Amino acid sequence: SIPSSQYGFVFNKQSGLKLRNDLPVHKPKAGQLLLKVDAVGLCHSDLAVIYEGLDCGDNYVMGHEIAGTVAAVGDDVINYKVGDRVACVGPNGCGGCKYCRGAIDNVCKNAFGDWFGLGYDGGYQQYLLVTRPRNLSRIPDNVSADVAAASTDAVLTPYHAIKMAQVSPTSNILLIGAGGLGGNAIQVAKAFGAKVTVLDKKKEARDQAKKLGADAVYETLPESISPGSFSACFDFVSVQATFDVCQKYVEPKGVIMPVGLGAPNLSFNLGDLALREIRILGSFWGTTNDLDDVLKLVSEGKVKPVVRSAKLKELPEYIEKLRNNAYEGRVVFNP
Amino acid sequence: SIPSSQYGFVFNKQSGLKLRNDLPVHKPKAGQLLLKVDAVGLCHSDLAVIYEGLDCGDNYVMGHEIAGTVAAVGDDVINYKVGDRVACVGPNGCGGCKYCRGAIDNVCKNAFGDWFGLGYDGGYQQYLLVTRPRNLSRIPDNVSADVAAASTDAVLTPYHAIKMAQVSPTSNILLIGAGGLGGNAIQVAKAFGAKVTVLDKKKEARDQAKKLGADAVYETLPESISPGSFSACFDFVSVQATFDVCQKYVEPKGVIMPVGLGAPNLSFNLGDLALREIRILGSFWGTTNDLDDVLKLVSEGKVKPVVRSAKLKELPEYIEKLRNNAYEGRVVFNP
Amino acid sequence: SIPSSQYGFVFNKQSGLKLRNDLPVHKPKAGQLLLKVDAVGLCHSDLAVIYEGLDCGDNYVMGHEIAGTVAAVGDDVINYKVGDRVACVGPNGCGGCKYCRGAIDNVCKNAFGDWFGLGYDGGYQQYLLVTRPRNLSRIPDNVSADVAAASTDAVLTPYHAIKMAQVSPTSNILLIGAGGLGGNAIQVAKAFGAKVTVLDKKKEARDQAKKLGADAVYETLPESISPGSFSACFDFVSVQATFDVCQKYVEPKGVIMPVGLGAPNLSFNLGDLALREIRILGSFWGTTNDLDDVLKLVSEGKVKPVVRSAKLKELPEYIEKLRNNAYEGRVVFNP
Amino acid sequence: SIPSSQYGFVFNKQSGLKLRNDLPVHKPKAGQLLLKVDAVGLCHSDLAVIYEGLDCGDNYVMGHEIAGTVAAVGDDVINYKVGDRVACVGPNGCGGCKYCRGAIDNVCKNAFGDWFGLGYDGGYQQYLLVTRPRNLSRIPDNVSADVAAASTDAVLTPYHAIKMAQVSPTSNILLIGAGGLGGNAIQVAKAFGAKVTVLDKKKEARDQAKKLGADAVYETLPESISPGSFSACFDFVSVQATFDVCQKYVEPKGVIMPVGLGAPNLSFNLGDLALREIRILGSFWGTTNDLDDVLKLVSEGKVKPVVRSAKLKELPEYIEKLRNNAYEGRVVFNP
Ligand SMILES: O=C(CO)c1ccccc1
Ligand SMILES: O=C(CO)c1ccccc1
Ligand SMILES: O=C(CO)c1ccccc1
Ligand SMILES: O=C(CO)c1ccccc1
Ligand SMILES: [Zn+2]
Ligand SMILES: [Zn+2]
Ligand SMILES: [Zn+2]
Ligand SMILES: [Zn+2]
Ligand SMILES: [Zn+2]
Ligand SMILES: [Zn+2]
Ligand SMILES: [Zn+2]
Ligand SMILES: [Zn+2]
């Protein structure tokens, strides 16, 4: 019993994010599929689109952290049957260019501004039209639709980055910033078997880290901790200051991964980077395969993300709370 | 002016390959695309389907070595416009599973028996329906539709294998069997800058190799050639005998690549393979991206494949010729 | 107080392994180093040298699973000072050829028949002359000299192979044979975060596996377990039968690692290996760096090997016990 | 007939580089080896040590671009016999730490300030004491001692960087600065089969490039050349300006390699680097194995470096010439 009208929050550069009860319910052209949204997360990114003026285009339902159930499938759709529970791979790669075909759909030039809920329609509605089903990840049975939604960015982003760094059980990494996403980072790192050293200014952030399995936690790296000794450094703050710490403490041939949004530019010392073959790798969100891995890990209990439910219509208020960083535990919404 | 009826050679397990003047001309559902076939090759593979009983299913136009021009595109098709010249990526990966999304669409479990002209409809017709456009490679302007067609298997297969082996300019490889596809192998190997040593029983095969740029050519590997000294061995014959030569002459941590069809099983010496960390890697055809690379190489003139044209309807005779190995220079057909 | 005479067990092809109280105590030429043996293990390998006729040369103290303390260092030795506790990297790579310089000293052509206690002098003496100190791994303080000794083969071999397979937390591996070394394999695999499925005929072997953290344990792989679904297969039995199981159950582009000694030759099905890009990688023992990682893991308690001590002179009896497989829990000996 | 006194140019922070006729001729402690210097190059690096104040320590013969012949070998030296012609691997890695054992001896923490002729004694003498023979590369018979010496930095550095970038025949790279070392870079890149686009301000540099095999050469990159289209960018100038060009023109997931010395710091745009997964890899000189590859390539004639001979004693003047960049064609010296 699929309706033909539905409610949802659209975003318009003129009117901001406004609720609407007159939203269509597209039927699946063949190859496409209709997803009944079960849980959709909210993170800081969403706020940059609304307040901070991040241009992703105009007139789209929002929310990229999407989990839902297959409601209707166009003909020709054979990998998904109605009922199948799935998660949305944010970047919504095009699935046909050299980057997607090459295992990096997260950087697809063609899909720019066609990301779920950041160009294309998101999950802040009730029934989402999935133009390209390749960008879906089957949700393991033992995983709630809320937990999955939480993982689409909060866990996927860090997993992608740590995988990029090729962290192993012999790894000795440094994490700067255990608050933002950086919480799940710790669990993900540990799941790889690494020795994780966390660095944070805030006392809660540090306590959390301890409880989460961090091997060492510091306000400031001690003098006993020797320079150029970490195999990989993940800067979640990413400010000239923090990056400098990374380049100081990363070992030869190591990896510095600026995965924060704290400065528009960062500088590195050419002589040091060169002489010690330091590698600075940029990573962004995750691939469709990554999300597959992320759910296998959440399902396996190696990562447990922290989320609290809410009737979708309650969104507006949670956004004002988060706008003033009045909440810092992922919030998923049930439409 | 796209007709609605067309001619082509269908394959039926009951009647073999038979010409038909009553073939439909499917119009592109959105997302699909119609390809006017310009050149379609024929290779031994095709013969195993017809005589040797290789099961790929029933009732499909055949020929997987396909080159043609975009004639009509469904709506939603934005990466290809009418006119665009393209080549068919044989395996026709599904473009939505863990293997396709992960850069190995050539092993897509979902596309089994849906390969162009080996499960799904091939290029032995006039107008092919391309269900998934991801499996197309833009043909460089300076490349004839015949040369492209030649490359879809003859060159693509070896290129994929050699890339898999990570051959470099410092490589020292051994090639066994310069007749079958093995001809293009030599050029491809040289294009990577490797030192190629060819081994063949037939004298023509050897002469060809010389002319093609082989660094050394032998009937039998000389005693002066030291054991365990080749970085990679490509057995194009793949017979217990030839494989034994590879394992004898490949160096520690080297690669033995059984890329022939000469025996259903091959055995290796466990003690030697383990003690010298020998790697046996299986490869098959190529990926969509590989074909992209293959055309950049053919266009760049680093690989010139050998092909002779023919009106498509002339197919039946060429198949009887090849059936008794009466021809050994790729034959493309123009429909 | 370094003596100049010492006891130890030498191996002669004529007299077998015989105790000797007249053994020299070589003083360190510069660059060399003298190691006071603290614990030396015994494994099946040793038996093939003595009974089964494995040729490694003649007249050497035996035992390759070596742990000890630095007793005297030649001049020029700056990385090790007297006192430093170390473990012996079996292969004793040459440290100067393309393989050692290239991170694979375990396959050094130059060091053939110069392996500790399998060509060169081992640890079944009291004071071993370490010709090349590069082949030593500092033993973490919290690790007993017995545990270290245990790890030089028992753990090192499997860790090297698993790392070679690039097992990750998203991995889904299959292990065939949880008795021989295969016990530590399980822990090592788990330390990487993989999902381990074990397969063994013996009931104890299976029970052990369960207790050790195996995710699934079977006598025979169930029919519910789908073919071509494991990322990597480690055959510790390595018999045509077991290898066949691997090739049946390994997924496309997967890894089959014949790490057992059950047959001198094994055969694979060419068509399957090729069509599904299956990779057969041979591995052998471990590198110097591997042992570094192995001790960081043992020290970190991610792997706890099972060993029982014994006065070195008690060796002869333990060898007869093991000769009739009357003992199956690694035995280290203190000289 | 090995003397016991010899001439050479020592460097002292107080007196600069001064000739000396009273230099010892160390006899090889076992494991060591004595090299009769045949050719020793001179490059800008050497000038930073003498004028620009680069601290590498005190009192050492200089010149790191060393080629010579084995004159005496200590006992225990089995890989080299007297007579063997060899080249010096600059970094002189320690051959015993995690970095050297792991294939990156060029970043050895232990060998800091113990580099040939930049901490330890160089080739500006007649007979050099090679403490660690692992850091030697056999010189191919068809390669002059002068050409080898030229290659130890001039060719080795770029080869190491290009290999690090994994340039292939399908690569499309950008080179900024074809004067400094950047000349050999072009040949090296072409030896891998890449499509090389060079960018230089000076007109000679550009003309050279053309003659050297560059595919395209520009004063300023044209507007027809599309942004984010190069697989790898090598900045040999490395100035905020040039780096910016790299980040603008490198494609998604591409490589920017700041291999020049034009600025002490460089900044990158975080948003772009992250959103397009751009990788900035630092490289430095080369490994011992790299030099092995470099000589195989020079011997194979794929790279022909440009050098002019000179009696060693003529050094002082060539240094004043180069000091005012009055010469720009590598100069090797025969002692
Ligand atoms: O949604 C994300 C990544 O989590 C994002 C990050 C950078 C730019 C735009 C959006
Ligand atoms: O068409 C190919 C590869 O060229 C083939 C190879 C093996 C089995 C079936 C088909
Ligand atoms: O000691 C080992 C590996 O554990 C061995 C393995 C194969 C051949 C000779 C010796
Ligand atoms: O000699 C070199 C590399 O060519 C060098 C480069 C950077 C710092 C010190 C020395
Ligand atoms: Zn988000
Ligand atoms: Zn794409
Ligand atoms: Zn074919
Ligand atoms: Zn697929
Ligand atoms: Zn052993
Ligand atoms: Zn070696
Ligand atoms: Zn230099
Ligand atoms: Zn070192």
Side-chain angles (χ1 to χ4, degrees), chain B residues 113-155:
Chain B
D114 199 52
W115 302 347
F116 292 112
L118 303 169
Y120 178 73
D121 290 313
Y124 286 162
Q125 76 190 299
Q126 306 195 267
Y127 290 90
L128 168 47
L129 176 67
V130 165
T131 52
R132 289 174 238 122
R134 89 181 277 295
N135 303 288
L136 298 178
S137 218
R138 215 112 24 191
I139 309 183
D141 295 324
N142 72 337
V143 187
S144 72
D146 314 60
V147 175
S151 314
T152 47
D153 184 317
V155 180

Short mmCIF file of all heavy atoms in Angstrom, two decimals, chain B residues 113-155:
data_model
loop_
_atom_site.label_atom_id
_atom_site.label_comp_id
_atom_site.label_asym_id
_atom_site.label_seq_id
_atom_site.Cartn_x
_atom_site.Cartn_y
_atom_site.Cartn_z
N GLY B 113 26.95 -15.84 -17.57
CA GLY B 113 26.02 -16.23 -18.61
C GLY B 113 25.23 -15.01 -19.10
O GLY B 113 24.14 -15.16 -19.67
N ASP B 114 25.75 -13.80 -18.87
CA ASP B 114 25.14 -12.57 -19.37
C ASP B 114 26.25 -11.73 -20.08
O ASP B 114 26.16 -10.53 -20.27
CB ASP B 114 24.47 -11.79 -18.24
CG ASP B 114 23.45 -10.78 -18.76
OD1 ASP B 114 22.58 -11.18 -19.54
OD2 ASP B 114 23.49 -9.59 -18.40
N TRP B 115 27.30 -12.43 -20.48
CA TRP B 115 28.42 -11.85 -21.18
C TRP B 115 27.99 -11.51 -22.60
O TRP B 115 27.22 -12.23 -23.17
CB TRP B 115 29.55 -12.88 -21.25
CG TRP B 115 30.02 -13.35 -19.94
CD1 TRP B 115 29.73 -12.81 -18.74
CD2 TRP B 115 30.93 -14.41 -19.70
NE1 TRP B 115 30.42 -13.45 -17.74
CE2 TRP B 115 31.16 -14.45 -18.31
CE3 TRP B 115 31.59 -15.33 -20.52
CZ2 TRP B 115 32.01 -15.36 -17.72
CZ3 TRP B 115 32.44 -16.22 -19.94
CH2 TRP B 115 32.65 -16.23 -18.55
N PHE B 116 28.50 -10.44 -23.18
CA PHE B 116 28.13 -10.13 -24.55
C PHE B 116 28.48 -11.29 -25.49
O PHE B 116 29.63 -11.73 -25.57
CB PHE B 116 28.82 -8.86 -25.00
CG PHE B 116 28.35 -7.64 -24.30
CD1 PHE B 116 29.16 -6.96 -23.43
CD2 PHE B 116 27.10 -7.13 -24.56
CE1 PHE B 116 28.74 -5.78 -22.84
CE2 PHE B 116 26.67 -5.94 -23.98
CZ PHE B 116 27.48 -5.26 -23.12
N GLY B 117 27.48 -11.78 -26.20
CA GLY B 117 27.67 -12.87 -27.14
C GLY B 117 28.16 -14.20 -26.57
O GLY B 117 28.83 -14.97 -27.31
N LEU B 118 27.83 -14.45 -25.29
CA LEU B 118 28.20 -15.65 -24.54
C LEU B 118 27.30 -15.70 -23.33
O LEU B 118 27.73 -15.92 -22.19
CB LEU B 118 29.66 -15.58 -24.08
CG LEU B 118 30.75 -15.40 -25.16
CD1 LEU B 118 32.07 -15.09 -24.56
CD2 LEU B 118 30.86 -16.66 -25.98
N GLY B 119 26.02 -15.48 -23.59
CA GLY B 119 25.00 -15.50 -22.54
C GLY B 119 23.96 -14.45 -22.87
O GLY B 119 22.77 -14.68 -22.89
N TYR B 120 24.44 -13.25 -23.14
CA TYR B 120 23.57 -12.15 -23.52
C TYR B 120 23.86 -11.99 -25.01
O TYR B 120 24.77 -12.66 -25.55
CB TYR B 120 23.92 -10.90 -22.73
CG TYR B 120 23.09 -9.73 -23.10
CD1 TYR B 120 21.80 -9.67 -22.71
CD2 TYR B 120 23.60 -8.71 -23.90
CE1 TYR B 120 21.00 -8.63 -23.10
CE2 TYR B 120 22.82 -7.66 -24.31
CZ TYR B 120 21.51 -7.62 -23.91
OH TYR B 120 20.68 -6.60 -24.37
N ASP B 121 23.11 -11.12 -25.68
CA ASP B 121 23.28 -10.91 -27.12
C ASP B 121 24.59 -10.25 -27.50
O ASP B 121 24.98 -9.25 -26.90
CB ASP B 121 22.11 -10.10 -27.69
CG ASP B 121 20.81 -10.88 -27.72
OD1 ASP B 121 20.85 -12.06 -28.18
OD2 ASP B 121 19.77 -10.31 -27.30
N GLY B 122 25.25 -10.79 -28.52
CA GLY B 122 26.54 -10.28 -28.97
C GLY B 122 26.54 -9.25 -30.09
O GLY B 122 25.60 -8.46 -30.25
N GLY B 123 27.61 -9.25 -30.87
CA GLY B 123 27.73 -8.30 -31.94
C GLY B 123 27.60 -8.91 -33.32
O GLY B 123 27.95 -8.23 -34.28
N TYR B 124 27.17 -10.18 -33.42
CA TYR B 124 26.95 -10.82 -34.73
C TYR B 124 25.56 -10.46 -35.24
O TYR B 124 24.90 -11.26 -35.84
CB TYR B 124 27.05 -12.35 -34.67
CG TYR B 124 28.46 -12.87 -34.52
CD1 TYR B 124 28.70 -14.18 -34.08
CD2 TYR B 124 29.55 -12.05 -34.79
CE1 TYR B 124 29.99 -14.65 -33.91
CE2 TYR B 124 30.83 -12.50 -34.63
CZ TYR B 124 31.06 -13.81 -34.19
OH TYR B 124 32.36 -14.24 -33.99
N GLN B 125 25.10 -9.26 -34.92
CA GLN B 125 23.84 -8.78 -35.39
C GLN B 125 24.17 -7.38 -35.89
O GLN B 125 25.34 -7.08 -36.10
CB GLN B 125 22.81 -8.78 -34.27
CG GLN B 125 22.94 -7.68 -33.27
CD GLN B 125 22.03 -7.93 -32.08
OE1 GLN B 125 20.82 -7.99 -32.23
NE2 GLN B 125 22.60 -8.09 -30.90
N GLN B 126 23.18 -6.52 -36.07
CA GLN B 126 23.47 -5.18 -36.63
C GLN B 126 23.34 -4.05 -35.66
O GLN B 126 24.00 -2.99 -35.82
CB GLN B 126 22.51 -4.88 -37.77
CG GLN B 126 22.49 -5.92 -38.85
CD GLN B 126 21.82 -5.43 -40.11
OE1 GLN B 126 20.61 -5.64 -40.31
NE2 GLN B 126 22.61 -4.77 -40.98
N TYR B 127 22.46 -4.29 -34.69
CA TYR B 127 22.11 -3.36 -33.63
C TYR B 127 21.95 -4.06 -32.29
O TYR B 127 20.93 -4.68 -32.05
CB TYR B 127 20.78 -2.67 -33.98
CG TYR B 127 20.87 -1.72 -35.14
CD1 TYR B 127 20.66 -2.14 -36.45
CD2 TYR B 127 21.16 -0.37 -34.93
CE1 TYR B 127 20.73 -1.23 -37.53
CE2 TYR B 127 21.24 0.55 -36.00
CZ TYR B 127 21.02 0.12 -37.31
OH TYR B 127 21.03 1.06 -38.34
N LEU B 128 22.94 -3.88 -31.40
CA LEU B 128 22.97 -4.51 -30.08
C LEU B 128 22.40 -3.69 -28.97
O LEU B 128 22.73 -2.52 -28.86
CB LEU B 128 24.41 -4.84 -29.73
CG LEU B 128 24.69 -5.24 -28.30
CD1 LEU B 128 23.68 -6.29 -27.80
CD2 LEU B 128 26.09 -5.78 -28.24
N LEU B 129 21.57 -4.29 -28.14
CA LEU B 129 21.01 -3.56 -27.01
C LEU B 129 21.94 -3.58 -25.79
O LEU B 129 22.10 -4.62 -25.15
CB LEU B 129 19.66 -4.17 -26.61
CG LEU B 129 19.05 -3.49 -25.37
CD1 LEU B 129 18.69 -2.05 -25.74
CD2 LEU B 129 17.85 -4.25 -24.84
N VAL B 130 22.54 -2.45 -25.44
CA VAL B 130 23.44 -2.45 -24.30
C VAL B 130 22.69 -2.16 -23.04
O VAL B 130 22.43 -1.01 -22.73
CB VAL B 130 24.59 -1.44 -24.50
CG1 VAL B 130 25.32 -1.18 -23.17
CG2 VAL B 130 25.60 -1.99 -25.51
N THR B 131 22.35 -3.20 -22.30
CA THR B 131 21.62 -3.07 -21.05
C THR B 131 22.36 -2.20 -20.05
O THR B 131 21.74 -1.34 -19.42
CB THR B 131 21.38 -4.46 -20.42
OG1 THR B 131 22.63 -5.20 -20.33
CG2 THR B 131 20.39 -5.24 -21.25
N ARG B 132 23.67 -2.43 -19.89
CA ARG B 132 24.47 -1.63 -18.94
C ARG B 132 25.61 -0.91 -19.63
O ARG B 132 26.63 -1.51 -19.94
CB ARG B 132 25.08 -2.54 -17.91
CG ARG B 132 24.13 -3.10 -16.93
CD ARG B 132 24.93 -4.08 -16.07
NE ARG B 132 24.18 -5.23 -16.32
CZ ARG B 132 24.34 -6.45 -16.78
NH1 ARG B 132 25.42 -7.08 -17.20
NH2 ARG B 132 23.16 -6.97 -16.97
N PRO B 133 25.45 0.40 -19.87
CA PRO B 133 26.47 1.21 -20.54
C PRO B 133 27.80 1.35 -19.81
O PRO B 133 28.80 1.82 -20.37
CB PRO B 133 25.79 2.54 -20.72
CG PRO B 133 24.41 2.11 -20.98
CD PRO B 133 24.17 1.10 -19.88
N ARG B 134 27.83 0.92 -18.56
CA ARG B 134 29.09 1.00 -17.84
C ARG B 134 30.09 0.11 -18.58
O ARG B 134 31.26 0.38 -18.63
CB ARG B 134 28.96 0.55 -16.34
CG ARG B 134 29.17 -0.94 -16.08
CD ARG B 134 29.00 -1.27 -14.66
NE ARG B 134 30.19 -1.04 -13.85
CZ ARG B 134 31.34 -1.69 -13.98
NH1 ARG B 134 31.51 -2.61 -14.92
NH2 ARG B 134 32.35 -1.40 -13.17
N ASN B 135 29.62 -0.94 -19.23
CA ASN B 135 30.54 -1.86 -19.86
C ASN B 135 30.96 -1.55 -21.28
O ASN B 135 31.18 -2.45 -22.10
CB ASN B 135 29.97 -3.27 -19.69
CG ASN B 135 29.75 -3.62 -18.19
OD1 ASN B 135 30.70 -3.84 -17.45
ND2 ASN B 135 28.50 -3.64 -17.76
N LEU B 136 31.13 -0.25 -21.52
CA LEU B 136 31.55 0.32 -22.80
C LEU B 136 32.82 1.13 -22.63
O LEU B 136 33.01 1.76 -21.57
CB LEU B 136 30.44 1.23 -23.36
CG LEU B 136 29.11 0.59 -23.65
CD1 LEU B 136 28.18 1.66 -24.13
CD2 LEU B 136 29.28 -0.51 -24.70
N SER B 137 33.67 1.15 -23.66
CA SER B 137 34.91 1.92 -23.62
C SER B 137 34.97 2.84 -24.83
O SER B 137 34.92 2.32 -25.94
CB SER B 137 36.05 0.97 -23.69
OG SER B 137 37.07 1.44 -22.86
N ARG B 138 35.08 4.17 -24.64
CA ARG B 138 35.09 5.09 -25.79
C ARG B 138 36.23 4.80 -26.73
O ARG B 138 37.35 4.74 -26.31
CB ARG B 138 35.19 6.53 -25.34
CG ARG B 138 34.40 7.54 -26.24
CD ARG B 138 33.19 8.14 -25.45
NE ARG B 138 33.52 8.03 -24.01
CZ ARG B 138 32.67 8.24 -22.99
NH1 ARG B 138 31.40 8.59 -23.23
NH2 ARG B 138 33.08 8.08 -21.72
N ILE B 139 35.96 4.61 -28.01
CA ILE B 139 37.03 4.32 -28.94
C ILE B 139 37.66 5.60 -29.44
O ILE B 139 36.99 6.47 -29.99
CB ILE B 139 36.57 3.56 -30.18
CG1 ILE B 139 35.75 2.33 -29.78
CG2 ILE B 139 37.77 3.21 -31.06
CD1 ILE B 139 35.32 1.47 -30.97
N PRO B 140 38.97 5.72 -29.27
CA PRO B 140 39.75 6.87 -29.68
C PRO B 140 39.49 7.11 -31.16
O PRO B 140 39.39 6.16 -31.94
CB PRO B 140 41.18 6.42 -29.42
CG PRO B 140 41.04 5.53 -28.31
CD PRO B 140 39.83 4.71 -28.66
N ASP B 141 39.42 8.39 -31.54
CA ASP B 141 39.16 8.74 -32.92
C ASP B 141 40.09 8.14 -33.95
O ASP B 141 39.65 7.75 -35.03
CB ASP B 141 39.13 10.26 -33.05
CG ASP B 141 37.98 10.86 -32.27
OD1 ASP B 141 36.89 10.20 -32.25
OD2 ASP B 141 38.15 11.95 -31.69
N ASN B 142 41.36 8.04 -33.63
CA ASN B 142 42.32 7.50 -34.59
C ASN B 142 42.34 5.98 -34.64
O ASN B 142 43.26 5.39 -35.20
CB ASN B 142 43.73 8.02 -34.30
CG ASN B 142 44.33 7.42 -33.05
OD1 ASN B 142 43.62 6.95 -32.16
ND2 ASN B 142 45.67 7.45 -32.96
N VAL B 143 41.32 5.36 -34.06
CA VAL B 143 41.27 3.91 -34.07
C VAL B 143 40.08 3.39 -34.82
O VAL B 143 38.94 3.70 -34.47
CB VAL B 143 41.25 3.32 -32.66
CG1 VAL B 143 41.37 1.79 -32.70
CG2 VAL B 143 42.38 3.92 -31.87
N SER B 144 40.35 2.60 -35.84
CA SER B 144 39.30 2.00 -36.63
C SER B 144 38.40 1.12 -35.76
O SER B 144 38.82 0.57 -34.71
CB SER B 144 39.90 1.13 -37.73
OG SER B 144 40.46 -0.05 -37.19
N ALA B 145 37.16 0.97 -36.20
CA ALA B 145 36.23 0.13 -35.50
C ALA B 145 36.69 -1.34 -35.57
O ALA B 145 36.36 -2.16 -34.72
CB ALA B 145 34.85 0.31 -36.11
N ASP B 146 37.49 -1.68 -36.57
CA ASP B 146 37.98 -3.04 -36.70
C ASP B 146 39.09 -3.29 -35.71
O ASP B 146 39.17 -4.33 -35.07
CB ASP B 146 38.55 -3.29 -38.09
CG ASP B 146 37.66 -2.78 -39.18
OD1 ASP B 146 37.39 -1.54 -39.20
OD2 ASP B 146 37.25 -3.62 -40.02
N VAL B 147 40.00 -2.34 -35.60
CA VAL B 147 41.08 -2.53 -34.70
C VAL B 147 40.52 -2.63 -33.30
O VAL B 147 40.91 -3.51 -32.54
CB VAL B 147 42.07 -1.39 -34.81
CG1 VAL B 147 43.15 -1.54 -33.76
CG2 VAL B 147 42.68 -1.37 -36.18
N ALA B 148 39.59 -1.75 -32.94
CA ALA B 148 38.98 -1.80 -31.60
C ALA B 148 38.42 -3.21 -31.33
O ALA B 148 38.78 -3.89 -30.36
CB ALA B 148 37.88 -0.75 -31.50
N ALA B 149 37.53 -3.66 -32.20
CA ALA B 149 36.96 -4.97 -32.06
C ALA B 149 38.04 -6.05 -31.79
O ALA B 149 37.86 -6.93 -30.93
CB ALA B 149 36.15 -5.31 -33.32
N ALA B 150 39.14 -5.99 -32.53
CA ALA B 150 40.24 -6.94 -32.38
C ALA B 150 40.75 -6.97 -30.91
O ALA B 150 40.92 -8.05 -30.27
CB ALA B 150 41.35 -6.58 -33.35
N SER B 151 40.92 -5.76 -30.37
CA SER B 151 41.42 -5.55 -29.03
C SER B 151 40.58 -6.02 -27.85
O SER B 151 41.14 -6.28 -26.80
CB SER B 151 41.66 -4.06 -28.86
OG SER B 151 42.35 -3.55 -29.97
N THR B 152 39.26 -6.11 -28.01
CA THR B 152 38.38 -6.51 -26.91
C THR B 152 38.66 -7.84 -26.27
O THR B 152 38.18 -8.10 -25.17
CB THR B 152 36.97 -6.46 -27.32
OG1 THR B 152 36.86 -7.11 -28.57
CG2 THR B 152 36.51 -5.03 -27.42
N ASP B 153 39.41 -8.70 -26.95
CA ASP B 153 39.78 -9.95 -26.30
C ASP B 153 41.26 -10.12 -26.61
O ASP B 153 42.11 -10.20 -25.71
CB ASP B 153 38.98 -11.14 -26.86
CG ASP B 153 39.28 -12.51 -26.11
OD1 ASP B 153 40.45 -12.87 -25.79
OD2 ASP B 153 38.31 -13.27 -25.88
N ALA B 154 41.58 -10.16 -27.89
CA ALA B 154 42.96 -10.41 -28.28
C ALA B 154 44.04 -9.64 -27.55
O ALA B 154 45.13 -10.16 -27.26
CB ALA B 154 43.09 -10.22 -29.74
N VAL B 155 43.75 -8.38 -27.28
CA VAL B 155 44.68 -7.50 -26.59
C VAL B 155 44.25 -7.35 -25.12
O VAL B 155 45.04 -7.53 -24.22
CB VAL B 155 44.75 -6.11 -27.28
CG1 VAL B 155 45.70 -5.22 -26.60
CG2 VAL B 155 45.24 -6.26 -28.66
#
